[PDB]
Amino acid sequence: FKDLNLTDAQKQQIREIMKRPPLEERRAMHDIIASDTFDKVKAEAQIAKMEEQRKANMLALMETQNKIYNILTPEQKKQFNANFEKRL
Amino acid sequence: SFKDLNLTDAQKQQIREIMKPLEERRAMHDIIASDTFDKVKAEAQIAKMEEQRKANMLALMETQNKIYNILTPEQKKQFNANFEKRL
Ligand SMILES: N[C@@H](CCC(=O)O)C(=O)O
Ligand SMILES: [Cl-]
Ligand SMILES: [Cl-]
Ligand SMILES: [Zn+2]
Ligand SMILES: [Zn+2]
Ligand SMILES: [Zn+2]
Ligand SMILES: [Zn+2]
Ligand SMILES: [Zn+2]
Ligand SMILES: [Zn+2]
Ligand SMILES: [Zn+2]
Ligand SMILES: [Zn+2]
Ligand SMILES: [Zn+2]
Ligand SMILES: [Zn+2]
Ligand SMILES: [Zn+2]
Ligand SMILES: [Zn+2]
Ligand SMILES: [Zn+2]
Ligand SMILES: [Zn+2]
Ligand SMILES: [Zn+2]
Ligand SMILES: [Zn+2]
Ligand SMILES: [Zn+2]
Ligand SMILES: [Zn+2]
Ligand SMILES: [Zn+2]
Ligand SMILES: [Zn+2]
Ligand SMILES: [Zn+2]
Ligand SMILES: [Zn+2]
Ligand SMILES: [Zn+2]
Ligand SMILES: [Zn+2]
Ligand SMILES: [Zn+2]
């Protein structure tokens, strides 16, 4: 949101606050799904490989949201926190 | 999208047979709403549910593989084409 009444300074701070696409990963997933048989050990290896991209993506998402939280005023943080409850 | 594939009645029954949470949000919330970003704590949060994620993914991928294999040649081409166009 869009719920927080962001000052123009804050939105510039935010714009400034905001690796490779997990594409070869999807390819390996495709090959597991399209196979004549299910290969559990190969699937486990794909899951484990996906954990490294997920870690990167989660760390980036949490760090971004943390830096945004800390440009907010007390009133805005309260609204941010309420909104966080309301998703999903 | 498996339903977009003109499933036969037999396939609908086969899929039926084949097919036979906030505690983690709260930890993310604690990491986000802090006056500093604690990367060590975040990495531990991210890793906590690794084994449940694995069990869930494995079940999904196996279910997907099972459904893919009841498709006809035509249906598989449609599914694979849609897969290429997505994500
Ligand atoms: N709220 C503190 C807890 C202490 C710690 O984890 O070091 C932090 O996120 O850093
Ligand atoms: Cl793909
Ligand atoms: Cl929460
Ligand atoms: Zn305001
Ligand atoms: Zn307002
Ligand atoms: Zn600037
Ligand atoms: Zn592939
Ligand atoms: Zn593909
Ligand atoms: Zn391939
Ligand atoms: Zn292939
Ligand atoms: Zn294959
Ligand atoms: Zn194997
Ligand atoms: Zn295993
Ligand atoms: Zn195992
Ligand atoms: Zn990796
Ligand atoms: Zn970085
Ligand atoms: Zn950084
Ligand atoms: Zn408020
Ligand atoms: Zn107010
Ligand atoms: Zn308000
Ligand atoms: Zn808690
Ligand atoms: Zn810690
Ligand atoms: Zn810490
Ligand atoms: Zn394990
Ligand atoms: Zn165990
Ligand atoms: Zn099984
Ligand atoms: Zn069949
Ligand atoms: Zn064809």
Supply the CATH number for residue A51's domain. 1.20.120.1490
Pocket of ligand 1 (CB under 6 A): B 34, 38, 41
Task: Assess B22–A contact: CB distance below 8 Å, yes or no.
Answer: no
Smallest Cα–Cα separation from A53: which of A24, A16, A31? A24
CA B54 to chain centre: 10
Q: ∠ at Cα A20 (A18, A24), nearest 5°?
A: 150
Q: Are B1 and B86 in contact (CB under 8 A)?
A: no
Lookup: tokens for A73: 């005023």
Q: Specify the resolution in Å.
A: 1.9
Q: ∠ at Cα B36 (B35, B39), nearest 5°?
A: 150
Beta strands in A18-72 (DSSP E): none
Q: How far apart are the first and last CA of chain B?
A: 13
- Nearest-CA residue for ligand 1 atom 8 is B38
CA of A42 to the centre of ligand 5 (A): 51
Name the DSSP letter for residue A87.
-
**Residue burial B56-85, b: 16+ Cβ < 10 Å; e: rest:** ebbeebbebbbbbbbbeeebeebbeeebee
Lookup: tokens for A6: 């962001």
Q: Report the C-alpha gap between B66 and B63 in whole angstroms.
A: 5
Q: How far is CA B60 from CA A20, A40, B3, B75, in A?
A: 25, 12, 17, 20
Q: Are B66 and A36 in contact (CB under 8 A)?
A: no
Element housing A72 (H / E): none
| Residue of B1, B31, B36, B37 best to disrupt the A interface, most CBs of A under 10 A | B37
Query: What 3 state SS string does chain B have?
Result: CHHHHCCCHHHHHHHHHHCCCCHHHHHHHHHHCCCCCCHHHHHHHHHHCHHHHHHHHHHHHHHHHHHHHHCCHHHHHHHHHHHHHCC
Q: Provide the number of structural domains found in chain B.
A: 1
- If phi > 0 it is left, if psi is from -120 to 50 it is alpha, else beta; for residue B75 that is alpha
Q: Is A13 helix (H, G, I), strand (E, B) or coil?
A: helix
Range of the domain at B27: 1-87
**Residue burial A53-78, b: 16+ Cβ < 10 Å; e: rest:** ebeeebbeebbebbbbbebbeeebee
Q: Report the C-alpha gap between B79 and B2 in whole angstroms.
A: 7
Q: Are B26 and A81 in contact (CB under 8 A)?
A: no
- Structure-token match 């079940």, residue found: B59
Give the distance from residue A10's alpha carbon to the nearest chain B alpha carbon, in angstroms.
16
Instruction: Burial-class residue B46 by CB neighbours within 10 Å (0-12, 13-18, 19+).
Output: buried
